């Protein structure tokens, strides 16, 4: 659900779409994530391990 469930009723949302609007919250356009979705997931999977 993202940040919405902390402000009201939880709303379903794709995780790759949630991350695209979290990149939008730091100063990088959403096109960065989708062009490197597989690489970023590998980075996140390796970092969390």
């Amino acid at each position: 659900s993202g940040w919405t469930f902390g402000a009201g009723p939880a709303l379903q949302i794709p995780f790759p779409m949630q991350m695209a609007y979290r990149f939008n919250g730091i100063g990088v356009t959403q096109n960065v994530l989708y062009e490197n979705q597989k690489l970023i997931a590998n980075q996140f999977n390796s970092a969390i391990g």
């Binding site: 790759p16 062009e35 979705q37």
Partner: peptide, 23 residues
């Protein structure tokens, strides 16, 4: 390259306005 992209069309607001006056 984008995963999940779907097919659609975007309405250009210039070409119908640009062509109607000349034609």
């Amino acid at each position: 390259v984008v995963i999940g992209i779907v097919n659609n069309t975007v309405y250009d607001p210039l070409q119908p306005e640009l062509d109607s006056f000349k034609e």
